[PDB]
Amino acid sequence: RQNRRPELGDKFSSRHGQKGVCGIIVKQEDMPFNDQGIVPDIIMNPHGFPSRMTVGKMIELISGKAGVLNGTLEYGTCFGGSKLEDMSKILVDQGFNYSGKDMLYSGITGECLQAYIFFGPIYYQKLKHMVLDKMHARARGPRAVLTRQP
Amino acid sequence: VEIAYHKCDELITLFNKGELETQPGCNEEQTLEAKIGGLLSKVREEVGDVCINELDNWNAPLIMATCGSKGSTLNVSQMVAVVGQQIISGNRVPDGFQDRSLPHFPKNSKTPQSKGFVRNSFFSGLSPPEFLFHAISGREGLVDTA
Amino acid sequence: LGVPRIKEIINASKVISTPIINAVLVNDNDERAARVVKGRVEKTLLSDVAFYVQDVYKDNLSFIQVRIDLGTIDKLQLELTIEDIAVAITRASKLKIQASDVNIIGKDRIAINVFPSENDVFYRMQQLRRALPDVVVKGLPDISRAVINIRDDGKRELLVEGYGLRDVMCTDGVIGSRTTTNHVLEVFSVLGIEAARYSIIREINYTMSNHGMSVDPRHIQLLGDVMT
Amino acid sequence: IEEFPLKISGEEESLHVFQYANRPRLVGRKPAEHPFISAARYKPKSHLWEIDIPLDEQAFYNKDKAESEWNGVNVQTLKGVGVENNGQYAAFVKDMQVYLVPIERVAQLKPFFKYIDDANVTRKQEDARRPPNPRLTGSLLAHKVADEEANIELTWAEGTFEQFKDTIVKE
Amino acid sequence: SKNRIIVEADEKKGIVQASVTSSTHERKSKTYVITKNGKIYLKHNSIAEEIPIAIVLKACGILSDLEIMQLVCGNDSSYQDIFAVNLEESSKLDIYTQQQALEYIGAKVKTMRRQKLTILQEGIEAIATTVIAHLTVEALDFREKALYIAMMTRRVVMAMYNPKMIDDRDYVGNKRLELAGQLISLLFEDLFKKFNNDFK
Amino acid sequence: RAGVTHVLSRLSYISALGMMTRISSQFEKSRKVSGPRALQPSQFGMLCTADTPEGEACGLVKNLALMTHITTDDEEEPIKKLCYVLGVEDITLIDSASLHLNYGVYLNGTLIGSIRFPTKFVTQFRHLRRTGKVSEFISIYSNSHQMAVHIATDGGRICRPLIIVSDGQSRVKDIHLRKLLDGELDFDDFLKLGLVEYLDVNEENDSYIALYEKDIVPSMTHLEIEPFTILGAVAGLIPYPHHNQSPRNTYQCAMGKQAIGAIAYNQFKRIDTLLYLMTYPQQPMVKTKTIELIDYDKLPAGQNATVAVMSYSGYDIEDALVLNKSSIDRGFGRCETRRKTTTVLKRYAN
Amino acid sequence: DEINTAQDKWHLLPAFLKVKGLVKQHLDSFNYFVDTDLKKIIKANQLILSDVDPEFYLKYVDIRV
Amino acid sequence: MLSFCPSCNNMLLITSGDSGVYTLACRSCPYEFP
Amino acid sequence: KEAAAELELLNADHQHILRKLKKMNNKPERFMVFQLPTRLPVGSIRVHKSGKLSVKIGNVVMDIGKGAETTFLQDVIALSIADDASSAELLGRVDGKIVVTPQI
Amino acid sequence: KPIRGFCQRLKGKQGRFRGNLSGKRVDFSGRTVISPDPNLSID
Ligand SMILES: [Zn+2]
């Protein structure tokens, strides 16, 4: 038996078909924060959504955030499910932006950010292929009996 | 997208009359096949050009397609306006059985929105008939590497 | 134009796919003369010019009868006599006949008889009954289907999907100075060796430029010289 | 409005129906006639039917070649296997009445070239004259019982007027 | 899909039709309909040669030879001219009868190695008409097996009349999804008879 | 044939369930032909579409749908007696002329009857089948290129059930759908009474399936029961797939089997070869009607964190990830590796 | 809850999977093999016999698992 | 070629007849015609 | 549609088998063969309103179906065999063939 | 089931001359995953 902590290298996923590897590990001071001080957990760049055309994560994050403040779990089905216009009505009563597009300060310098942010809870499941049992090196080791090769 | 539909309507009903333009290339019943792909490739590029002059600045699929960073003017157009018609190795989704594609569509009905074309955007959603026609070219994107 | 365009060039393959050849004309306008070489170059099949074929018996004759449509000669503008058909029956060694038995009967009608390990009377005139209307009477006996089209100028050309090349230069209405082609290793037979090199130079940078990428001209003049 | 009642009057009689593949129903909007049965033949337990027929003389007969090889003249027999099925009842229609009879079997009479066979039975024999010296079951068991059994010469007649009476008297 | 017919289209080696059949007693046999140079033939893995079809339906009793043109082609079409070459192969060997039509096959079979020491040489084509096209079996008439060859032969002529009629073998209706419990049973009866013959 | 059995993969819960519904093909040496590699349109609801592996095994592995029953053969003898009652002729009687003029019933590819005017023959037979005198796994595939109709009873072929619609009004009968929720009207009684029936791939030729009740025509049969039942149980966990791109579905369905989470309730008792766990699992926020039928939520895989999609510090260029040291220190997904090892005490000849 | 047949046709899809599961294929195929087909095998290889001692026989009458 | 010999429906055959006459007459059936 | 192109043919043969019924009332050694539904769970051939033939052959069992279906390019004759003796008598040729089928 | 031989290994994919003579195996290597870093220089 052994356990381990998700240090960098470990392959993560997104449940909409995005392979992804942990780049670095920042501290909490460097992370940004909203008006309430909620620090986000995972960062991904916006540069996947035009290429991968993954509209689902763009609407799941809206479907997720309004459900938490209402305290209710929301159904995402194929060919149906909960719509958008009834979902924007919920969190605008809570006081947030009408499509989750919030704004938050920078943790490294203090002031506002010139653009707006997009925010919410998304479901990141860990995969296999962790890196602690793939790093290996053979400096000078055993040789084959027929070829004298590694 | 209805302008191209009723232009197709006068172009599909010329089977009882028997019209044949006879382009150079020995058509023999493809003039009502090889032309609709030309006009469906007109509505596929025109509506994608309406967005560029009618979208505001500081728009992120716009500002990274204005550069050569990642994307195009066609990639954003399939996300907001229309996804176009799926092609299969130079064929506009040929028939599945009994001169048709699906049990959801009538007999020998040679219209787009029934063979290949899907008119609604990824933001709007996909119907259970048109969901399958996207899921054929998406298979072709993985086969051709092999 | 892709990977299965490059593969047969570096193989020097005898059987090339779609061997179209290029021939430029003499005239520029049609004048019923831009398609008259298309009749002179296409494999004219007689089943298009024949109309009605049957076997005629009086009491003691076994001869097939063929009648032509002279309005077809007026229609598609081809030029031929009547006697050159009767030549071309015995010019086919696949059908086993005697050389000189052919009798002409009138203008449009033409008939040929045969006569004698037995009972071949019924057999040979039934074998030849369908094995007659499949022979060339005029045109190049190698090519398949010539297609005339228009370039971006008023001058027009003729595209022939065949394997014979030298007799294309031998025919009329065409020049023997600008007739390009495909299938490099038959230009090695026809136009020496130095044409086949420049043919390889011309083909690869044509079939690559239409995929967007362009490596260099100079990466191909080494490939031509290392093979030749 | 009107009803025509039908009753079944048939037992103990098995009638077979023959099918002539060569002989069509009509000839030029005119119904033809059945060929005259010269002789008949039946084999029980194998259910064959060898109807002999006469073909006409000199006009289309080709006599001199016909007698040379096979030596069989003016007799053209045709074989048909009697096949049964359920349903398929025969009936004559009376005025305002109709009575029914069950059909036992139906045969399909195919031309049985016997003279070419018999000439080639002897051709097997005469080739054997000059040198002269030097468990199965199922469908092939049904052939070894069909070739060797008793043959019965059926007296071909035209009757059935007695049989027309026999159906009406039965209630 | 076992125990059905499937049509095929091949460019340069002619075109072939296949029909595989396997009943549960020793049977693993597939039948071919080849079209060599305009003439139809039938080859099987028990027959050493190819046989034109105008014999084998006369071997089943259907010999009138105007039935055969009307079954294959029908009437008022181009099929009769397409079939017109096939009829004369019956004329060359001069069989013309139901009796001679059997032993032509059995003279060109190399099978069974004389397992029965009492041959008939005329009965060994009744069983050669029994180990073939194992969808249907026969008792005395050879009726339904005859036309089943002809209905097979109507497809292969329509294939040469236009190549669009040929269907692919990747249509989902041509696939028999075969499960586990009906597959472990095939190993069981093979192994269960290996038990008791070692026990005897 | 080899490799007919396989060790089931216990990486996730659904990984042990997704391997229960998969298909291994015959590899008929058609490696040059892209026919079997591609996807045919006669697959909607027959079997799943968006879960197919990539790489070497690219299109020869396929997966069942969500509503799917496999047929079984019953008998071909009494249905041959049944069609003779319906007024069909016998094979040993017809002329050569009539068979090409009329149509013909095919029993498993074999003609027997040479029927005429098939529409009275076929529609009465549906009325014989929906009443339930003949068994329900029979298909009346009836083409028109050749002159024939087909009868199929071979069993072991694909089929799915859909509800019968007679005319411009369906046979829905919402009071029966209320009587189901009372608990005495199960799904087997829908096909007994005559309100649902199984269709193979061949019967979907003759059918004209409707999508929705707002799409009913007076020329429209066989309303479709539920349109999102076209995805497999290992494909069903994608939320809102109809907005998402289709090549980004197979990339997840190949990865969904590699997701770590719980395994089973007895997972602290079993001794398996190399078996991972997640310490703190959580059910997802946006669920699916699919995942509550397989009880994926009762033992999930993976957890939902708070994302802020943005570029930051240049350490995420193309689909890299950036996270904080605190959340790992609070315990953000601390996985755990369990590994078997074994040895056998062995007795010798001495 | 005024129930209708418009959006509540879904509520029989659990009623399918409840009585008739998702491992239908492997349960129902193997369970048919146990009851029915095992009798059909011994009825195809009943009555073992030997040539020596011809009045000896052994017969398989039934099968139970 | 519509060469049906009636009462057998088999075939016709071009036979080299007397003085080479091209009468049509089939085998396995006693029938003849010019 | 095309599925209505034979109910008029179902009318176009009730009037074309009743004409053959009427001409053969003179019982001139004419025969007609037709198939009966076996497997029963006597009657009367009757016409309904405006060209509609049916029978009721059972106590309850009603049969509506009557359709003259074949094309007949051959000849048939009925003959009765009796006990394998001098019993070969030819009855007569069959003019028409119809079928009897129940409704479902 | 067919037995190997001398000629049965000198030809073929990576039997000889391709996995033993053309492309061998080396010492002093490694094979790990990668992760980006801007803050160090090119080279
Ligand atoms: Zn004849």
Swiss-Prot record, chain B:
Localization per Swiss-Prot or TrEMBL: Nucleus
Spans annotated as Bridging helix: 128-140
Subunit structure: Component of the RNA polymerase III (Pol III) complex consisting of 17 subunits.
Summary of the function given for this chain in its UniProt record: DNA-dependent RNA polymerase catalyzes the transcription of DNA into RNA using the four ribonucleoside triphosphates as substrates. Largest and catalytic core component of RNA polymerase III which synthesizes small RNAs, such as 5S rRNA and tRNAs. Forms the polymerase active center together with the second largest subunit. A single-stranded DNA template strand of the promoter is positioned within the central active site cleft of Pol III.
Note: Present with 6020 molecules/cell in log phase SD medium.
Family per record: Belongs to the RNA polymerase beta' chain family.
Protein name in the entry: DNA-directed RNA polymerase III subunit RPC1
Gene source species: Saccharomyces cerevisiae (strain ATCC 204508 / S288c) (Baker's yeast)
From Swiss-Prot, chain F:
UniProt KW keywords: DNA-directed RNA polymerase, Metal-binding, Nucleotidyltransferase, Nucleus, Transcription, Transferase, Zinc, Zinc-finger
Disulfide bonds: none
Subcellular location: Nucleus
GO biological process per UniProt: termination of RNA polymerase III transcription; transcription by RNA polymerase III; transcription initiation at RNA polymerase III promoter; tRNA transcription by RNA polymerase III
Principal location class: nucleus
Gene Ontology CC entries for this record: mitochondrion; nucleoplasm; nucleus; RNA polymerase III complex
Single annotated GO MF: DNA binding
Other information: Present with 1950 molecules/cell in log phase SD medium.
Record-stated family: Belongs to the RNA polymerase beta chain family.
Subunit structure and binding partners: Component of the RNA polymerase III (Pol III) complex consisting of 17 subunits.
Biological function: DNA-dependent RNA polymerase catalyzes the transcription of DNA into RNA using the four ribonucleoside triphosphates as substrates. Second largest core component of RNA polymerase III which synthesizes small RNAs, such as 5S rRNA and tRNAs. Proposed to contribute to the polymerase catalytic activity and forms the polymerase active center together with the largest subunit. Pol III is composed of mobile elements and RPC2 is part of the core element with the central large cleft and probably a clamp element that moves to open and close the cleft.
Name recorded for this polypeptide: DNA-directed RNA polymerase III subunit RPC2
Span covered, complete protein: 451 to 800 of 1149
Curated annotation (Swiss-Prot), chain H:
GO cellular component: nucleolus; nucleoplasm; nucleus; RNA polymerase III complex
Keyword Nucleus included in the entry's annotation: yes
GO molecular function: DNA-directed RNA polymerase activity; nucleic acid binding; zinc ion binding
Binding, Zn(2+) 1: 5, 8, 26, 29
A GO biological process held by the record: transcription by RNA polymerase III
UniProtKB keywords: DNA-directed RNA polymerase, Metal-binding, Nucleus, Transcription, Zinc, Zinc-finger
Zn finger limits (C4-type): 5-29
Subcellular localization: Nucleus, Nucleolus
Major place of residence: nucleus
Presence of keyword Transferase: no
Annotated family: Belongs to the archaeal RpoM/eukaryotic RPA12/RPB9/RPC11 RNA polymerase family.
Quaternary structure (record): Component of the RNA polymerase III (Pol III) complex consisting of 17 subunits.
Function: DNA-dependent RNA polymerase catalyzes the transcription of DNA into RNA using the four ribonucleoside triphosphates as substrates. Component of RNA polymerase III which synthesizes small RNAs, such as 5S rRNA and tRNAs. Involved in Pol III transcription reinitiation and RNA cleavage during transcription termination.
Protein's UniProt name: DNA-directed RNA polymerase III subunit RPC10
Lineage summary: Eukaryota, Fungi, Dikarya, Ascomycota, Saccharomycotina
Swiss-Prot record, chain I:
Highest rank taxon of the organism: Eukaryota
Localization in the cell: Nucleus
Subunit-level organization: Component of the RNA polymerase III (Pol III) complex consisting of 17 subunits. Interacts with RPC37/RPC5. RPC53/RPC4, RPC37/RPC5 and RPC11/RPC10 probably form a Pol III subcomplex.
Functional description taken from the UniProt entry: DNA-dependent RNA polymerase catalyzes the transcription of DNA into RNA using the four ribonucleoside triphosphates as substrates. Specific peripheric component of RNA polymerase III which synthesizes small RNAs, such as 5S rRNA and tRNAs. Essential for tRNA synthesis. The RPC53/RPC4-RPC37/RPC5 subcomplex is required for terminator recognition and reinitiation.
The family this protein is said to belong to: Belongs to the eukaryotic RPC4/POLR3D RNA polymerase subunit family.
Any further remark recorded for this protein: Present with 998 molecules/cell in log phase SD medium.
The protein's name in its UniProt record: DNA-directed RNA polymerase III subunit RPC4
UniProt organism field: Saccharomyces cerevisiae (strain ATCC 204508 / S288c) (Baker's yeast)
Lineage: Eukaryota, Fungi, Dikarya, Ascomycota, Saccharomycotina
Gene: RPC53
Residues of the full protein shown: 274 to 422 of 422
